[PDB]
C-alpha cells in the first residue's frame, strides 16, 4: 500500500530523493520507516532503519526523513554504483510488514531519450487458433524504466495484462513488451484498444481497432 | 559473518506442498525474529510472514495467511516455511531475513540480513514446443516480428534469416503466463521499401523440446 515513484534519475554527482508515500497506519503512525537497495541480480541490504538511521558500513551520502504519511531517502552526491532500485518498507496498523512499490534510480549516463511505440493487433492466425494477443513493443527510450496502462475503447483494463521489465538493446538504448491477453471475442467485441507508455512523466498512447489494418 | 542460506525451492505442480528452510549463522539466533520475504521474477519485494526469537509470536501477509506456517528450530538454527495450496501467484525467490531487534516480541523491523534466496516455480506444465506467431507490418521503417508463444521449459532462442539478419534485431525476456507457459516476442525494424522483395523469416530453437520452426514473415493483407 506504499506508494514510491517508478523511476528517478539525476545526473552523477547530484542529489536526488525518493518518496514513499503511505498512510496513518504505516509510515504516518510509527517510526518503522526503512529503505532497501536492491542492485540486479541480489538480494536487498539495508540502508536505512527507523526512518534516519543508517547501518554501520552504509554511506553517509544517503539519508532518510519523514512528514505524516510520506517517507524520503536522499541520496547525495549520485554515482554510478547508486544505481539500483529501492524500496521502503514500514509496520502497519494489521500487525504486518510493508514494502513499497518501489523505485528504479538511473545515474544518467547517456542522453534522455523518448520512448518509440509499435503495438500490434493478434494475427489472423492466433484468431484462427482462437486466441489473441495485443502486443505492445516499447524501444530506444532512455532511463530505462516505464509503466503501460491498457484501455480498450476508453476505460482502463488489468486482467490479462503481462510487462517485461527493461533490457537494453543492441543499441545500448532500452526496450519493454507488454501484452494484453483477451479471447477473439473480446478482440472483436470493442472499437479500439490503446497501449500507453509513461516515460519520466510524459505518455505515449498508440491505438489499434479491429476493423482497420 | 551473517549468513543466511535458503533452500528447499523447485518446480512444484499447484496445490501441492513444498518446504522451505533457511539456515543462520554468524549471531545468535535463538535471540532474533525472522521474516520470509518473496519476490516474483521481475516484480517487487512482498512481506511474507514473521517469527519471533522463540516462536511465540506469528504473523503472516493476508495473500498467503492459512495457506503458509512459519516456524522454527533454535536446535538446529534454522528457520522454516510451509508451503501449501500452492497456486502459479506464488512463484518467486524467496528470502528469509533476520530481524534486527534482540529478544522481543514485536516485530516491526528493520529487516536486518539477507539470505541470497531460492526459486520455487509453482507450475503443473511438462515440456512443450512452441507455436509461433507472426507480427506483420502494416501502419521509411517498419517493425516486424514473431511472436513465441505458450512453450516449458526455458530457453528458446531466436533468429532471423537464419542469422544473415542483425541489425535491428531485439528478443525479449520471457513472460510466464498464468497457465505457467513461457512466451516471448522478437522484433526487427527494416526499411519499408524491402518489405515487397526481401524474406523474413524467424527461427526459433527450443532445445528443451527438440523442436525447431522457422515462421514466414508477410505483409498483411488489409
Known amino acids: 500500500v506504499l506508494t514510491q515513484p517508478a523511476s528517478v534519475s539525476g545526473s552523477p554527482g547530484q542529489s536526488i530523493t525518493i518518496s514513499c508515500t503511505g498512510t496513518?497506519?504505516?509510515?504516518?503512525?510509527?517510526?518503522?520507516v526503512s529503505w532497501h537497495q536492491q542492485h540486479p541480480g541480489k538480494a536487498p541490504k539495508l540502508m536505512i532503519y527507523?526512518?534516519?538511521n543508517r547501518p554501520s558500513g552504509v554511506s553517509n551520502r544517503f539519508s532518510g526523513s519523514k512528514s505524516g504519511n510520506t517517507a524520503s531517502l536522499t541520496i547525495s552526491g549520485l554515482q554510478t554504483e547508486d544505481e539500483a532500485d529501492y524500496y521502503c518498507?514500514?509496520?502497519?496498523?494489521?500487525?504486518?510488514?510493508?514494502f513499497g512499490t518501489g523505485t528504479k534510480v538511473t545515474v544518467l549516463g547517456q542522453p534522455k531519450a523518448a520512448p518509440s511505440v509499435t503495438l500490434f493487433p493478434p494475427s489472423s492466425e492466433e484468431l484462427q487458433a482462437n486466441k489473441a494477443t495485443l502486443v505492445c513493443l516499447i524501444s530506444d527510450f532512455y532511463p530505462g524504466a516505464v509503466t503501460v496502462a491498457w484501455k480498450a475503447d476508453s476505460s482502463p483494463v488489468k486482467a490479462g495484462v503481462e510487462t517485461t521489465t527493461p533490457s537494453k538493446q543492441s543499441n545500448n538504448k532500452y526496450a519493454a513488451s507488454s501484452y494484453l491477453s483477451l479471447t477473439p471475442e473480446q478482440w472483436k467485441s470493442h472499437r479500439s484498444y490503446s497501449c500507453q507508455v509513461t516515460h519520466e512523466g510524459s505518455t505515449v498512447e498508440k491505438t489499434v481497432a479491429p476493423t482497420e489494418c | 559473518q551473517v549468513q543466511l542460506v535458503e533452500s528447499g525451492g523447485g518446480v512444484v505442480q499447484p496445490g501441492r506442498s513444498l518446504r522451505l528452510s533457511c539456515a543462520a549463522s554468524?549471531?545468535?539466533?535463538?535471540?532474533?525474529?525472522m521474516h520470509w520475504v518473496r519476490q516474483a521474477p521481475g516484480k517487487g519485494l512482498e512481506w511474507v510472514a514473521v517469527?519471533?526469537?522463540?516462536?511465540?509470536?506469528?504473523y503472516y501477509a493476508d495473500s498467503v495467511k492459512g495457506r503458509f506456517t512459519i516456524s522454527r528450530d533454535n536446535s538446529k538454527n534454522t528457520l522454516y516455511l510451509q508451503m501449501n495450496s500452492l497456486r502459479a501467484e506464488d512463484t518467486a525467490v524467496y528470502y528469509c531475513?533476520?530481524?534486527?531487534?534482540?529478544?522481543?516480541?514485536?516485530?516491526?523491523?528493520?529487516?536486518?540480513?539477507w539470505g541470497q534466496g531460492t526459486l520455487v516455480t509453482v507450475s503443473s506444465a511438462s515440456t512443450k514446443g512452441p507455436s509461433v506467431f507472426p507480427l506483420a507490418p502494416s501502419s521509411g521503417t517498419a517493425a516486424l516480428g514473431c511472436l513465441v508463444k505458450d512453450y516449458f521449459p526455458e530457453p528458446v532462442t531466436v533468429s532471423w534469416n537464419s542469422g544473415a539478419l542483425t541489425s535491428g534485431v531485439h528478443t525479449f525476456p520471457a513472460v510466464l503466463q498464468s497457465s505457467g507457459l513461457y512466451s516471448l516476442s522478437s522484433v526487427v525494424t527494416v526499411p519499408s521499401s524491402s518489405l515487397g522483395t526481401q524474406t523474413y523469416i524467424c527461427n526459433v530453437n527450443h532445445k528443451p523440446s527438440n523442436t525447431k520452426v522457422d515462421k514466414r514473415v508477410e505483409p498483411k493483407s488489409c
Open positions: 517469527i519471533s526469537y522463540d516462536g511465540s509470536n506469528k
Open positions: 496513518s497506519s504505516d509510515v504516518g503512525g510509527y517510526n518503522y
Open positions: 531475513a533476520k530481524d534486527k531487534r534482540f529478544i522481543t516480541m514485536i516485530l516491526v523491523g528493520p529487516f536486518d540480513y
Open positions: 527507523d526512518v534516519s
Open positions: 518498507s514500514s509496520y502497519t496498523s494489521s500487525t504486518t510488514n510493508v
Open positions: 554468524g549471531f545468535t539466533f535463538n535471540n532474533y525474529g
